[model samples]
Target: GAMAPSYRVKRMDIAKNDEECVVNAANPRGLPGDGVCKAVYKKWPESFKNSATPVGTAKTVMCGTYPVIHAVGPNFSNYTESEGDRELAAAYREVAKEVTRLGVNSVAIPLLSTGVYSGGKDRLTQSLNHLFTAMDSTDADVVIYCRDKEWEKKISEAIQMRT
Candidate 1:
């Protein structure tokens, strides 16, 4: 097996908001305060934000202490699942561009679609691919961090071949 030297991957348990869970659980709304976002901010003040940037919709925010590109999509069963998935993936791409515009060369991401937003892995595959492709994979290192090793492996395999 071979891997690229541009970045590294590791698995660990990180704080997560209930909003980002897989089950139909409770989640935080805008600029979430009482969940994983808060804990992440407490640990890494500079990276997480409770507000969306000017160029983004109200549903976007950043996480991680470093130059982390994070995006949390809204939950709405009213929309078709396909439409919802596209919106979520687009959010990831939007945040990724914002990270680059901010002059950050590296970012760490969690699974964007596998949580309470409850998109899916295939949709996430498209989202990550969209991010890396739009960014052109130049000088930027995208590190996807996950709490589950098996899921991480699946994502790593899915995105690794794309870019």
Candidate 2:
């Protein structure tokens, strides 16, 4: 059997479009069942709330019950890291800084660029190291979470190996 008329099907897809910001996707607000997420959002709603930019648009948003930062991106993935990306690192740092500034003693994070975006463990580790390196003397504990024990080990080992 043959079709009477030839036709072309225009294929296209739409994506969730938003200006991508650089931050860890693993922030407690996003992961519903992570023990840390439950604990933090339950106890310190303020800590996990609000987004801050100390330099540009240094405005604060209100607290959220869900994870705020997620998906590093193919949307905002940097081929080569730069000052702009560095600014983003600063932005993330400021978020943590503001959290501590409000009297929270610690912060938790996950591998910054890894996960669904296909960021390699090494690259993600480096990015996180950069963020931590930029951090000034603060009491806020930056805890990085992984899916399993091996991931935790990988991240910890990577940190040790890098620094």
Candidate 3:
């Protein structure tokens, strides 16, 4: 039997997501400066600002708009060739696995580790295969929320290529 897993690439705010859980692209080090992490920090200053996430892993925390998985993808700001690439992949894989482990039926997430972490288009392209593959393994209804249309476009292409 085939699993009818649900996923979407939507040009929408992660703030608006009504699912049981949503993901925040998080940092392995200090508090994040921008992108989805910033918004989440702003959303719950006490919760987000105080929390710490390890490199290439994820943590599920409560008391946010949705139960947000603060998933830490590899920081690429220091930039070397091919270093920490699939570590970014591992973040995505872990987040999906976390969702299943949490037993939540629906979740929303972002295409992680790409912008402020200095993972550009090439890294986005590389990391997403792990994401969708992990998403496919879950029974949860999932949405990949894109802050901009360009992210939506790139992830749409990834979906077409992967699923």
Candidate 4:
């Protein structure tokens, strides 16, 4: 009733936001290269060294107002394994918890399974479901970044269905 917590979809860069924090998919080591990691690293290289180090499956790296969240997925090349799903869901939960703990109201998140570690529709939908469900329970304003219109629409629809 309260505007659904301001969940909105847009066509733009995920890191190019003014939110209190931004979520990026990363390995346990917190290295940056593909997906939103590249953008974040380019903008703030100094922050990743100390902040981006792996802290188990998921970790939060602070970059002033735009702290980057490393939501670790599976190390496998594909999403055929059930472990990938489990890891992704866990990461989403961790991200939600961190944002809530830090009292960050606005946060931007990239679709976790559609980048260099591209997954099938089922995998993508599963990730979306897990992420939205986790973030929805919190008071944070979520912005999901999609690289193309199809993904944007897909993610938007997923958010609508979840919320």
Candidate 5:
């Protein structure tokens, strides 16, 4: 059997992936200034939206619809693999705590820092390594999201091998 049948892998799209809590990539600024953040940012109060979440910090804000957690990941373009992983690990670890705090039945997390930030080779393997370990600790059913649908099979394969 699988680790948890509810532990799924899918493409990252907030509207469709609708979980009780969506863990979005907060990048370093945590600005909610671009991408999905721009859409979800309106859910936050003006003050919190304006405020920033520093690197390695994860903060939960009012989607007032469903809770949203912002886990700030490093810019791999500027950071070494070890350094990036350090921050990535910290972010996901922090996110796991928020996952505990929210106590949601489901959670969705996208592959952080691999998009516009352009992470290094084998980053997918590294990111999933940290992400899966942290998410496994929470009771919530999880969805691991990748931007490219093709990676779904790759991730599914990885998940099976790891399990």
Candidate 6:
């Protein structure tokens, strides 16, 4: 077979990609329909927010052919704080863990803490770096979905500087 195992990072409009799963950052309640979650909510409202708990964890919701993985992260007000950054990192790692558990080959993730969390460029850069580091050994193709053009450029630049 010509197909080989691989791990990759790319930046693009995640909604356009019909990947096996789409991962997004949510609150402890796993509520979609807010900020970046609206997309997932619009498509699968009933299935998306049920498994949310008060803890920062990952919940996978089946939406048609694909599943939406919601990793509970911190609120916008907490993003600049140290604990918030740690929680955001945890959220990213949870996504990776859940992805591995689901045995999916392809997943798309958004820049956590950048949307309703309203994190700054530096924080977003740090979070992305931390997330990438956490998933360094993941076998799935991880795409960092970006809704904003500026954010995408920043992420691309940050990743370039990292390796």
Global lDDT of each model? Answer: 0.46, 0.38, 0.73, 0.69, 0.72, 0.68
- What TM value does model 5 have? 0.83
How would you encode candidate 1's per-residue C-alpha lDDT over 1-163 as one tens digit per residue? 0133243345653443221211111133334343444545554444434544321121223343233334555453434677766665566556555655665545455544455455333455554564455445445555555666676776777666655
RMSD of each: 7.1, 18.4, 2.9, 2.9, 3.4, 3.0
- The TM-scores, one per candidate, come to 0.61, 0.46, 0.83, 0.84, 0.83, 0.81
lDDT of 4 by residue, 24-110 (tens): 676555566686778877876655765544322556766665577767665436544677767677777788888887787788887
* Model 5 worst lDDT window (10 residues): 42-51
Residue 107 local lDDT, model 1: 47
Q: Give one digit per residue, the lDDT tens place, for model 2 in 109-158.
A: 44444443333334555555545654434544444555555655655665
Score residue 37 of candidate 5 by CA lDDT: 57
Tens-place lDDT per residue, model 5, 1-163, is 1234367797656535767877767755656556555545654434245336877778887655577788777878888878877888888899989888876778878766666554545567778888887887677888887657678888889878867
Off by over 4 Å in 1: 1-8, 13-29, 33-38, 45-70, 76-78, 119-126
Q: Arrange candidates by lDDT, highest first: which order?
A: 3, 5, 4, 6, 1, 2
Quote the lDDT for 15 in model 1.
43
Q: Which 10-residue window of candidate 2 scores lowest in summed lDDT?
A: 7-16
Screening candidate 4 with a backbone cut-off below 3 angstroms (N, C-alpha, C), the clashing residue pairs are none
Model 3, position 99: C-alpha lDDT score: 93
**How many clashing residue pairs are found in candidate 1?**
4
Overlapping backbone residue pairs in candidate 2 total 5
Model 6 whole-model lDDT (C-alpha atoms): 0.68
Model 5 CA lDDT for position 32: 57
